[PDB]
Design a protein around this nucleic acid. Structure first.
Lengths: 99, 241, 172
RNA sequence: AUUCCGGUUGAUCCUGCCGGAGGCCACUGCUAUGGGGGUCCGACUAAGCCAUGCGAGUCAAGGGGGCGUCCCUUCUGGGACGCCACCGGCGGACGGCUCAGUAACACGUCGGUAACCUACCCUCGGGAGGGGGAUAACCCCGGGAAACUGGGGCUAAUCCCCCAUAGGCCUGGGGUACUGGAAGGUCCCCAGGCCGAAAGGGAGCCGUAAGGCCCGCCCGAGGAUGCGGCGGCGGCCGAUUAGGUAGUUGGUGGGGUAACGGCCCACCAAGCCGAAGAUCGGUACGGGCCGUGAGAGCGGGAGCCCGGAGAUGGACACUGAGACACGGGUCCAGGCCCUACGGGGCGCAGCAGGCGCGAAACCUCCGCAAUGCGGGAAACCGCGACGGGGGGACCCCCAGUGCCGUGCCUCUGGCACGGCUUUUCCGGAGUGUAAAAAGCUCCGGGAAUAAGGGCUGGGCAAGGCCGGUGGCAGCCGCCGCGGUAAUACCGGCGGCCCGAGUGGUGGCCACUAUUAUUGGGCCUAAAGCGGCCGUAGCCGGGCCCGUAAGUCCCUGGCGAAAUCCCACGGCUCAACCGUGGG
């Protein structure tokens, strides 16, 4: 499996790079989030607990996955700002707030 | 309906915001303010959609509150606000400046112009009328107003260019429209064009009043006096489809 | 809908047409033929309308239709609206997935690819197409290879032998 | 994308009806809808009513506390959160649902209120000085099975008020300056009269307090937004409905409203309306569109968006810019329920769910996470509005139910037999949950493994035989078929069609030039008035001339989005949706 960076945004106000991933799997099952943790910290080039994994869907039979990840400087900022699905998929926090 | 609609629907959201109209079922309805709801561009659309700086309305509301936009020289904080046409929207945090302009298509586009022009806002005033102390006051369709004169005939009837200094809310450098002046066309079906007025002559009585113009290409157009908006001798640049 | 069912549907003359083409292009249902007939029919309707009207309808639209036919390959190089009218419902059976993979000779016959395409072994562009009714561009002919392979990941599989016997190509 | 067939007869041609073949939309039988994507579901019933859960709140950073707890400290003492009641402010008129009534200035488009208002909000200008004052909380206490209710001492705030600073409004007289297409609205002076502005903020930051970021209030002007109002045109059927009208048509004065107005009122007049169909009865939310058709035309108002109308039936006010108010009150009618029988409470034609009805239509699910919105500096709270899954012959789209060798039959194929790959299916991985689900998809193990239903005399000649039976039992949409070698019955076998559908009934549109404008007729097929007269109406010889109303041309304002076509892109693919053009 191979992770490549397609697209890079620089958001200054909050101090993060917003980043697009294409991840491959050829003859292999759908990418495994647990190895992708190990692989991520090097690709983004930021500490391991502030390099964040989000969004992947995986094509039907066409072996390419499209996806998004975050690289943050600020551990403080990230839990607060971000929409809850990310925080659980990375493993940070759950679901914020009920009724 | 017996009350202001507080909810706008997505299928009621136009094609002029260039928005997906089957996305949910509820569209962002600004609270009453400068401008019309369907002829505005929402603050939600500008942060969230346009630039990718939000992926939820909570991101975009938090981002606006901390600060990433000032509109007309002053602070905003919620995403509900109808941004007008011929306004000045600012990213202080990126240094971008935009004009809110029509296309030939008639969708709102933010058209980039330099940091310099952010200072300027051209006004062509909506009506001119007396207030107490025998002073006349200036008006707009975004409600942007100034007071204090000595009355009298003054610069024009109502077809003005003012240079407006936006943090100060001051008027400066007044200028008439002529029969050799510039207009950009910002309502009607002839929108996006910028040219030189041939003559401002019209149909002298009743409700219709024509004004006519030629351009650089030199096409002949006719539009209402109300839909003639005087840029000046050019201050902002043209809008592109 | 992409189903066309004519005014008289059990007439002798229709029925003969249908019966004969069933390993000549591959059928296993009539519907599949009906999709293709509907695509062509709409294209010929539009082509007819533009030609009928004066020049005062906007030529941009006639230019966009003609463009699409250059890529698809029905008008290969032609650029004529009258030329669309003359088209057969037999020029769109020849641009089927099953009769353009067999043309190159990766599918033994059109009949063969009714478990290659299911089991996902024939790729076009970057992706396994699964659909006999998929219609292939002239662009798209330049990339027809294989993926997610099991009988072509094993030459030693007798599947490989049944498909290629001295390499049976063309269309029949 | 423009098609015809059987049937009046012994045969023939015309006329004409019927039936069938096509699209679409309910419902109903069998089977199935694996798998996957999008739409959808009391949608032609009782606009019947409901048990039970739920759709309406929110600020302690306005505010002095009561209680639990925290940082503390373990004191004095200040800083926090939850919970709790009272005034403030804002939402509760919206959002959601339904379409009964209404054939009308309901609705659409263009006009237009210089007759009228518009808070929250947004802008610009300016103001918030001083004085006065309360009631819950707390403390104490009575009753009712309840609902619900209390009496009093103390007491906070952006608490409630007055005065001034003025402003507002009316009215009489003078005159200018802004805006206009005009009428004439806005300016100012003056006299006399009334009403007689406002309120502030904790822990932080900015300023000295006020003030401001933030939240809100006052006055002047504007904007936006909502409400009301006027006009042009368009705005169903029955003439076994032809004459209708008494605030009714107008004038004049006036009241009342936000405001024009016979809206209401007094007076004065007798007008107003009608055959280009008034009035009356009857039926119907209207529109974008949609269904069908080559078109012309016909048919329709359903999801969905737009505007109006309603919320057990009727009547009624208050608070608010905005209600005569969809989960508020008063009351009357009907009906339900609790009851110490004294007395209380309601409204699923709101949402789950129930029950009645009938030919017909769902889980007492999951979440507040995303979407929108109100309040809140924010954090965040509220949300059966909403996002989704569940279930559902409801529609649409996509896809699989094999392939090769192969002896031999029906070789556009089939079956035996052999070999191969292999949808489901299992184990694993992502997804996604924003915590489930939907389990697919991918990888490893790995099977040819979900296919049915209709028809077979002519219409569909598209598909043929046997046995039983013998005008019977039955079949039938039509013409018919059975009174004993039945292709038509019934069973069986075979074949043909189409395919997760097939078939039936009901309806609508095409076929139907059977509504004739395109595109029909009247000697004899159905159809000339017994004949005239002349009214309304329709239609007008030649030549000229004025107008340019009709009529043709050009530009410009505009006919919302969605639906529709074409193009490209994304989802394996496509339906579909985005985007641009039309």
């Amino acid at each position: 499996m191979e992770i490549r960076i397609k697209e890079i945004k620089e958001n200054k106000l909050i101090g993060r790079k917003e980043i697009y991933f294409e991840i491959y799997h050829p003859g292999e099952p759908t990418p495994s989030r647990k190895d992708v943790k190990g692989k991520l910290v090097a690709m983004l080039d930021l500490n391991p607990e502030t390099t964040v994994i989000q969004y992947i869907r995986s094509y039907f039979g066409s072996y390419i996955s499209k996806g998004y990840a975050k690289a943050y400087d600020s551990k403080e900022r990230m839990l607060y700002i971000e929409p809850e699905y990310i925080l659980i998929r990375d493993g940070l926090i759950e679901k914020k707030e009920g009724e | 309906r017996k009350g202001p609609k507080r909810h706008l629907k997505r299928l009621a959201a136009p094609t002029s915001w260039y928005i997906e109209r089957k996305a949910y079922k509820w569209a962002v309805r600004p609270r009453p303010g400068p401008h019309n709801m369907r002829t505005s561009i929402p603050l939600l659309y500008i942060v969230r959609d346009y630039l990718g700086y939000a992926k939820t309305a909570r991101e975009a509301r938090k981002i606006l509150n901390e600060g990433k936009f000032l509109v007309d020289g002053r602070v905003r904080k919620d995403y509900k606000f109808p941004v007008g046409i011929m306004d000045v929207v600012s990213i202080p945090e990126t240094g971008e400046h935009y004009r809110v302009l029509p296309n030939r298509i008639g969708k709102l586009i933010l058209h980039p112009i330099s940091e310099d022009e952010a200072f300027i806002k051209p006004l062509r005033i909506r009506n001119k009328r007396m207030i107490k102390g025998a002073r006349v006051q200036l008006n707009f369709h975004d409600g942007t107003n100034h007071i204090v004169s000595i009355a009298e005939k003054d610069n024009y009837f109502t077809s003005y260019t003012v240079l407006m200094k936006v943090p100060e809310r001051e008027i400066l450098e007044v200028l008439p429209f002529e029969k050799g002046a510039y207009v950009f066309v910002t309502q009607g079906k002839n929108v996006a064009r910028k040219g030189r007025i041939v003559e401002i002559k019209r149909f002298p009585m009743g409700w219709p009043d024509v004004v006519t113009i030629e351009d650089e290409e030199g096409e002949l157009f006719d539009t209402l006096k109300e839909y003639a908006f005087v840029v000046g001798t050019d201050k902002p640049k043209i809008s592109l489809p | 809908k992409k189903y066309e069912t004519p005014p008289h549907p059990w007439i002798k003359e229709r029925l003969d047409r249908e019966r004969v083409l069933m390993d000549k292009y591959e059928l296993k249902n009539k519907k599949e033929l009906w999709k293709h007939e509907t695509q062509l029919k709409n294209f010929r309707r539009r082509a007819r309308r533009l030609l009928a009207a004066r020049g005062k309808q906007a030529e941009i639209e006639r230019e966009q239709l003609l463009a699409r036919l250059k890529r698809l390959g029905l008008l290969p190089e032609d650029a004529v609206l009258d030329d669309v009218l003359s088209l057969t419902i037999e020029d769109i059976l020849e641009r089927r997935l099953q009769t353009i993979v067999y043309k190159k000779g990766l599918a033994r016959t059109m009949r063969q690819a009714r478990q290659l395409i299911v089991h996902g072994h024939i790729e076009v562009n970057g992706q396994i197409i699964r659909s006999p009714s998929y219609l292939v561009l002239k662009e798209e002919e330049d990339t027809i290879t294989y993926a997610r392979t099991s009988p072509f990941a094993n030459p030693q599989h007798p599947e490989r032998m049944m498909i290629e016997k001295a390499k049976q190509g063309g269309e029949a």
